[PDB]
Design a protein around this ligand. Structure first.
Ligand SMILES: [Cl-]
Ligand SMILES: [Cl-]
Ligand SMILES: [Cl-]
Ligand SMILES: [Cl-]
Ligand SMILES: [K+]
Ligand SMILES: [Mg+2]
Ligand SMILES: [Mg+2]
Ligand SMILES: [Mg+2]
Ligand SMILES: [Mg+2]
Ligand SMILES: [Mg+2]
Ligand SMILES: [Mg+2]
Ligand SMILES: [Mg+2]
Ligand SMILES: [Mg+2]
Ligand SMILES: [Mg+2]
Ligand SMILES: [Mg+2]
Ligand SMILES: [Mg+2]
Ligand SMILES: [Mg+2]
Ligand SMILES: [Mg+2]
Ligand SMILES: [Mg+2]
Ligand SMILES: [Mg+2]
Ligand SMILES: [Mg+2]
Ligand SMILES: [Mg+2]
Ligand SMILES: [Mg+2]
Ligand SMILES: [Mg+2]
Ligand SMILES: [Mg+2]
Ligand SMILES: [Mg+2]
Ligand SMILES: [Mg+2]
Ligand SMILES: [Mg+2]
Ligand SMILES: [Mg+2]
Ligand SMILES: [Mg+2]
Ligand SMILES: [Mg+2]
Ligand SMILES: [Mg+2]
Ligand SMILES: [Mg+2]
Ligand SMILES: [Mg+2]
Ligand SMILES: [Mg+2]
Ligand SMILES: [Mg+2]
Ligand SMILES: [Mg+2]
Ligand SMILES: [Mg+2]
Ligand SMILES: [Mg+2]
Ligand SMILES: [Mg+2]
Ligand code: NA
Ligand code: NA
Ligand code: NA
Ligand code: NA
Ligand code: NA
Ligand code: NA
Ligand code: NA
Ligand code: NA
Ligand code: NA
Ligand code: NA
Ligand code: NA
Ligand code: NA
Ligand code: NA
Ligand code: NA
Ligand code: NA
Ligand code: NA
Ligand code: NA
Ligand SMILES: [Sr+2]
Ligand SMILES: [Sr+2]
Ligand SMILES: [Sr+2]
Ligand SMILES: [Sr+2]
Ligand SMILES: [Sr+2]
Ligand SMILES: [Sr+2]
Ligand SMILES: [Sr+2]
Ligand SMILES: [Sr+2]
Ligand SMILES: [Sr+2]
Ligand SMILES: [Sr+2]
Ligand SMILES: [Sr+2]
Ligand SMILES: [Sr+2]
Ligand SMILES: [Sr+2]
Ligand SMILES: [Sr+2]
Ligand SMILES: [Sr+2]
Ligand SMILES: [Sr+2]
Ligand SMILES: [Sr+2]
Ligand SMILES: [Sr+2]
Ligand SMILES: [Sr+2]
Ligand SMILES: [Sr+2]
Ligand SMILES: [Sr+2]
Ligand SMILES: [Sr+2]
Ligand SMILES: [Sr+2]
Ligand SMILES: [Sr+2]
Ligand SMILES: [Sr+2]
Ligand SMILES: [Sr+2]
Ligand SMILES: [Sr+2]
Ligand SMILES: [Sr+2]
Ligand SMILES: [Sr+2]
Ligand SMILES: [Sr+2]
Ligand SMILES: [Sr+2]
Ligand SMILES: [Sr+2]
Ligand SMILES: [Sr+2]
Ligand SMILES: [Sr+2]
Ligand SMILES: [Sr+2]
Ligand SMILES: [Sr+2]
Ligand SMILES: [Sr+2]
Ligand SMILES: [Sr+2]
Ligand SMILES: [Sr+2]
Ligand SMILES: [Sr+2]
Ligand SMILES: [Sr+2]
Ligand SMILES: [Sr+2]
Ligand SMILES: [Sr+2]
Ligand SMILES: [Sr+2]
Ligand SMILES: [Sr+2]
Ligand SMILES: [Sr+2]
Ligand SMILES: [Sr+2]
Lengths: 56, 73, 237
RNA sequence: ACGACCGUAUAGUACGAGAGGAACUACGGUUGGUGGCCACUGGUGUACCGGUUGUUCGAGAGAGCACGUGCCGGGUAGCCA
RNA sequence: CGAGUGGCUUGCUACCUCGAUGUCGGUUCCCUCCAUCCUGCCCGUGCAGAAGCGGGCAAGGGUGAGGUUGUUCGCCUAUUA
RNA sequence: GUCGGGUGAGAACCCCGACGGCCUAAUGGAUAAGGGUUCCUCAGCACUGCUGAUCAGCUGAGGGUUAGCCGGUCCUAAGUCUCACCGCAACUCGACUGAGACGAAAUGGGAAACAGGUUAAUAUUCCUGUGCCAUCAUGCAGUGAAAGUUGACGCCCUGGGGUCGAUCACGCCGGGCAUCGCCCGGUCGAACCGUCCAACUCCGUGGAAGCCGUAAUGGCAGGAAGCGGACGAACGGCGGCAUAGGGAAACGUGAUUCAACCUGGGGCCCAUGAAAAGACGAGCAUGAUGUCCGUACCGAGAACCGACACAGGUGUCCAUGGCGGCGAAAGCCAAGGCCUGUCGGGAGCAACCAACGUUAGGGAAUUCGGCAAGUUAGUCCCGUACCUUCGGAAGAAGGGAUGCCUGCUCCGGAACGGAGCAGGUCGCAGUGACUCGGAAGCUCGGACUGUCUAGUAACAACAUAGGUGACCGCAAAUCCGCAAGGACUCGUACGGUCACUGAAUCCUGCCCAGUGCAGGUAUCUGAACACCUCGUACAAGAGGACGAAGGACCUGUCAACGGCGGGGGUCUUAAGGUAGCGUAGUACCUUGCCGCAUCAGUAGCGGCUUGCAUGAAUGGAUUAACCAGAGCUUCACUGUCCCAACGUUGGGCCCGGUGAACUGUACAUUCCAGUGCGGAGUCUGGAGACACCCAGGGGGAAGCAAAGACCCUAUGGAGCUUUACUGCAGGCUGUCGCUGAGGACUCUCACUCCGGGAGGAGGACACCGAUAGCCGGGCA
RNA sequence: CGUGGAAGUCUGUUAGAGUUGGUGUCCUACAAUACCCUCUCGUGAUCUAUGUGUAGGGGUGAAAGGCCCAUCGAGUCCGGCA
């Protein structure tokens, strides 16, 4: 069984869903954590300085 | 009895299994009554088909050399 | 390199854990205040997944139903006593002080009240040798002379299921079923059969530990493999 | 687009004490190569005719399917060696 | 001992090629060379004959099948002009 | 697919009929995930669709999913999160312990619904008929109420009960066929309410000393059979339900084999096969309440994932439709579905290619190699070697039989079950297709089943049982974390950790010098603090005394790393290779020598063997069995070959339609020589050369595809190693603080551990903070 | 002689799992791992669905440097960064 096309057929698991807090399809329904805004992980909003160039 | 093993494993393994299961399957004298009606129910568990006496003993024999020593002292 | 298997174990992930959710109970001695007026009846004999040996279900006078580390010879209907004034009989529990010298014992406590630590596996037994007002000398299954507090509780007789070790597994599948009931990663891949990155003995064309196996006691984890602080090796000498 | 060989007559002759043993020339055939042809022999021939197994069309008759013929036997033309 | 020719072996060089020109052997198919193994025509002989042996002209045609080994090579077998 | 026809401006592919076909664990039916309107209707063809299109999963416009009793919702599983507590510089981080919540839609547990009718599209939801559950209210009864039972459970073999289905017998209703008289379909009817009860268990009677009983095990004076009785089953039987429903009609009755479902007996475990909510226990009438969320459709060779309407991938159930046969096998056929694994037209349709059929004689001569193909084949009877771990080898081998028809016999209750006999008779051929082993010997390797490089390696590699060594008494050994803490562990030496070897069998020699580990150690060496001397009004600093682990030194140890030679009739550096095996998967020389086998054998096997450079758990030897493992031989067989032929299907060629990509400095009709950075279509000299187009196999363009897959270079990178350099974790050891009272000691009061508690054990140690010395590829 | 029905037991395209050889077909593919035949396993160290856990010098690994979403002798993303 190849890692490519043949293995893509088994993909029918729902994980990332629309997030109640930010509206992005990043709420991981299994972990119950939003990979975009961090809902379910932190009260504060997920944010990082590396999300932009250093001097901007 | 090790005929279920076929031509596999070698003499010693299936010689010991044979001798052990031979003695294990024998008619064992019940501690309660005197009848040779004790059978194994599982690992170290024995029971008499006559009086229904369920008791502990060796894994393959209802009595071990060590267990027989307890009585004396 | 990469952490060796022995280090992966420590993390306590699923692969290395024991099937605790499947286990029955810790066969600790009952806690009696005093008077010894605690006796019970063996209601059933059960198989213990954690020790591959039979264990006994007892129903005590005060209404307590508990599983007991059963010696050989215990059967349903039999009455068991636990306490200072307990009768000197197989399956009965009482402190070492009340036990007569030269009597096989099992499930011996390390510190009075702990519930039993020594001599608990299939067929084994400790031997109560010397008595005293301050110390009870017991010979453990390993042959070691152990000095214990005479107040330490123990059960008279040898542990049930003796001779278990006498029959060979014969096949891998049999070992397999047993290992599923324990906290152990099995089968076992030899160090010498792995890559250099995975173990101190890995690498090199043909297989061989490119170094002496006797490792120091002070060796750090990851390096402490092979023959740990061996006083000697081999069969000769 | 023809190359080569074997055999027979020459001849048990010439030669040679003997043993052995030629040639010119005339013939017959083989082999390798070459071009073409199917009367003959052989192959094929899911044209065709026959036998026959399972199943379906109620039987019979007559058929379908079982790979480009279910399987088996024979084989015209044609193409072939 | 001396003088040469070839470019089939090996060595030497590093001139061409590393933003890549697919190694050996075999197979299949085509052309060629001559330092000729056979075949044609010759000369000598320590050429009677038969057969050898050595040499000359000559590249039209031919030079096959098999056993071990990947082998090229080579050893081996029976055929062969 | 074809012939007719329908609609339309237009029809090969949209629809009707006929004829011809395809799918049968699926190409049919119901669904989980996932998709999200793809579902239904009307109107369309610019877009999407491998051609066309009036069609559509496409475009436009509307419409469509109805629940007390089907899921959800409730329960708890592995496990997750939150809060508290604690750690952390800190947190959105981290372990424990408490509490709370979360965690199962086919497929865990679970109160209750069936039949029919209806729509373009829903349907146990709507409608009709009937039924049922829970809660609450009212009324009667009830004083019982919580013990117990249930929910609730592994694997293997098996009996009994029994429905559907299928089949047989006969009747009825309807259809088909038309030499016969046979062939097909139907013959219905639920939940629920009521009732019946086999098995198991128990009681009474009885009184077996050999009887009772089973498919099998088994049972009994501790009371067998027999007899009577209590408790007690089906999704089953029976009655109601039902002058309900359904059917054009009839509107059956018996039987066998019996999936579901019910209930028993036996066996296995170094393996022991959830939990919780809930339910029963615990009556009946009447009435009220039963909200919220899901509900369409696809579920795949076009609705999912794979960029696609992709030959891939993707869970569950329909596992009992007929013939066939051992069969959930093949093949053929129903019910049902489809002609969309969606471009067509034409040429006896050439070469060439893909898949195939058939080939005389020879029969492996082909090839590295029987690669490919083929041979054999089902079942019954006879018969079956070496070797063997006694299991096996074995379907060894080898030999014979096999259909149809007529009449029978035996086993069984019987089968539409099985085993045979006699007679008759057809073919080239009777397992007639289909299904369906070729066989034998020798050698190497690994014992065996098992594992593996998703995507060039399935093996001799990994694993394994078995053998062995090492560590540790549990306040342990080993391991994770900075810490709080944690895995092992509901574990305790018959344990579990760390390693090596690799079934059985016979065995496993010598070496402790080096290295490693461990123990000991008079003496030597060995840091810091404190102490002492000098120095400084102090301090830096110099020296001294004491000296832990460590080292020196001694000892133990090879199933510890490893070693087992050269020379001579010892030497390096400890020993100097024992049993066995041996030209080996190890032997360079080498195609070693002898032999076997062959016409011929660098192969293979046997023997020899001084072994360039075998050898004993770096395991040696040996080995039955096993193997898509390497090599060799034989029989059988055949187009592998001699040497090729003919044929079949799909392409290829021609026509309609659709319609890319690779590649492209330029020029370019070349050929032979030469020259040139020595490998030129383009330079030179000659030769040849009228242009364009079709088909072809690929000689050349050092053809196209990639800033090699070999080599070197760079004060390039990375992974790996170690007695490289330098450091860092970690362990050990001393010292200071925690830390108290009276080079050796006692105590208790901190602190630690055990204990539910009282209290016990220990104790100024240990833990922890700081520092010092040693070890330190575990890590950078 | 029968009964019994054991087995990491045998045959087997039952379901299901896998992949020895053809170095077949394909190789601007149906397909960035496909097709066909042959072949292996198929009561167990079996296969399989969903849920759940382990995370990057870290997992997981019957060990092949295998696997951790077409990439692994150290994933992916963005940032350091021109
Ligand atoms: Cl074990
Ligand atoms: Cl010949
Ligand atoms: Cl639902
Ligand atoms: Cl029974
Ligand atoms: K190059
Ligand atoms: Mg316990
Ligand atoms: Mg496990
Ligand atoms: Mg191993
Ligand atoms: Mg390796
Ligand atoms: Mg390493
Ligand atoms: Mg080794
Ligand atoms: Mg150069
Ligand atoms: Mg090139
Ligand atoms: Mg010449
Ligand atoms: Mg010539
Ligand atoms: Mg329409
Ligand atoms: Mg519908
Ligand atoms: Mg299609
Ligand atoms: Mg022939
Ligand atoms: Mg040849
Ligand atoms: Mg073959
Ligand atoms: Mg009869
Ligand atoms: Mg060999
Ligand atoms: Mg193997
Ligand atoms: Mg691979
Ligand atoms: Mg394999
Ligand atoms: Mg072992
Ligand atoms: Mg062991
Ligand atoms: Mg090994
Ligand atoms: Mg091995
Ligand atoms: Mg030899
Ligand atoms: Mg040794
Ligand atoms: Mg390059
Ligand atoms: Mg490169
Ligand atoms: Mg390289
Ligand atoms: Mg250099
Ligand atoms: Mg580097
Ligand atoms: Mg504690
Ligand atoms: Mg390093
Ligand atoms: Mg899973
Ligand atoms: Na020269
Ligand atoms: Na070549
Ligand atoms: Na010539
Ligand atoms: Na040869
Ligand atoms: Na009933
Ligand atoms: Na059938
Ligand atoms: Na079409
Ligand atoms: Na197997
Ligand atoms: Na040594
Ligand atoms: Na050696
Ligand atoms: Na295998
Ligand atoms: Na052929
Ligand atoms: Na070309
Ligand atoms: Na690297
Ligand atoms: Na028997
Ligand atoms: Na394959
Ligand atoms: Na990394
Ligand atoms: Sr899935
Ligand atoms: Sr969170
Ligand atoms: Sr931020
Ligand atoms: Sr405990
Ligand atoms: Sr406890
Ligand atoms: Sr190594
Ligand atoms: Sr020894
Ligand atoms: Sr003549
Ligand atoms: Sr003569
Ligand atoms: Sr046909
Ligand atoms: Sr046949
Ligand atoms: Sr010449
Ligand atoms: Sr000549
Ligand atoms: Sr050469
Ligand atoms: Sr040679
Ligand atoms: Sr369906
Ligand atoms: Sr149009
Ligand atoms: Sr539609
Ligand atoms: Sr819930
Ligand atoms: Sr359910
Ligand atoms: Sr099962
Ligand atoms: Sr039955
Ligand atoms: Sr529906
Ligand atoms: Sr499919
Ligand atoms: Sr596939
Ligand atoms: Sr049909
Ligand atoms: Sr189409
Ligand atoms: Sr024919
Ligand atoms: Sr051959
Ligand atoms: Sr040959
Ligand atoms: Sr035969
Ligand atoms: Sr061996
Ligand atoms: Sr695999
Ligand atoms: Sr052995
Ligand atoms: Sr030593
Ligand atoms: Sr020797
Ligand atoms: Sr010119
Ligand atoms: Sr072409
Ligand atoms: Sr099997
Ligand atoms: Sr099989
Ligand atoms: Sr291959
Ligand atoms: Sr083939
Ligand atoms: Sr193809
Ligand atoms: Sr490919
Ligand atoms: Sr079976
Ligand atoms: Sr990706
Ligand atoms: Sr950057």
């Amino acid at each position: 069984t190849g890692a490519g096309t043949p293995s893509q057929g088994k993909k029918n698991t729902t994980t990332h869903t629309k997030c109640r807090r930010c509206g992005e399809k990043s709420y991981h329904t299994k972990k119950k954590v939003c990979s975009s805004c961090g809902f379910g992980k932190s009260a504060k909003r997920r944010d990082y300085e590396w999300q932009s160039k250093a001097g901007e | 009895s090790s005929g279920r093993f076929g031509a596999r494993y070698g003499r010693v393994s299936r010689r010991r299994v044979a001798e052990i299961e031979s003695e294990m399957n024998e008619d064992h004298a019940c501690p309660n009554c005197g009848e040779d009606r004790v059978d194994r129910q599982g690992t170290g568990i024995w029971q008499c088909s006559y009086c229904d006496y369920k008791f502990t003993g060796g894994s393959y024999k209802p009595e071990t050399p060590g267990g027989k020593t307890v009585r004396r002292s | 390199g990469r952490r060796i298997q022995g280090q992966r174990r420590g993390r306590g992930t699923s692969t290395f854990r024991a099937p605790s959710h499947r286990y029955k109970a810790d066969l600790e001695h009952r806690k009696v205040e005093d008077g010894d007026v605690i006796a019970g009846t063996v209601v059933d004999i059960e198989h213990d997944p954690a020790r591959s040996a039979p264990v006994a279900a007892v129903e005590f006078e005060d209404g307590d139903r508990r599983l007991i580390l059963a010696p050989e010879g215990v059967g349903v209907g039999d009455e068991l006593q636990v306490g200072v004034s307990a009768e000197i009989a197989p399956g009965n529990t009482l402190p070492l002080a009340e036990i007569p010298e030269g009597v096989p014992v099992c499930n011996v406590e390390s510190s009075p009240g702990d519930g039993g630590k020594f001599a608990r596996a299939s067929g084994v037994n400790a031997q109560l040798l010397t008595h005293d007002r301050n110390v009870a000398v017991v010979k453990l299954p390993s042959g070691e002379m152990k000095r214990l507090d005479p107040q330490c509780r123990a059960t008279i007789g040898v542990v049930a299921g003796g001779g278990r070790t006498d029959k060979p597994f014969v096949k891998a599948g049999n070992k397999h079923h047993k290992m599923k009931a324990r906290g152990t990663k099995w089968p076992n891949v030899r160090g010498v059969a792995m890559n250099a990155v995975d173990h101190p003995f890995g690498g090199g064309g043909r297989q061989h530990p490119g170094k002496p196996k006797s490792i120091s006691r002070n060796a750090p984890p990851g390096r402490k493999v092979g023959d740990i602080a061996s006083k000697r090796t081999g069969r000769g000498g």
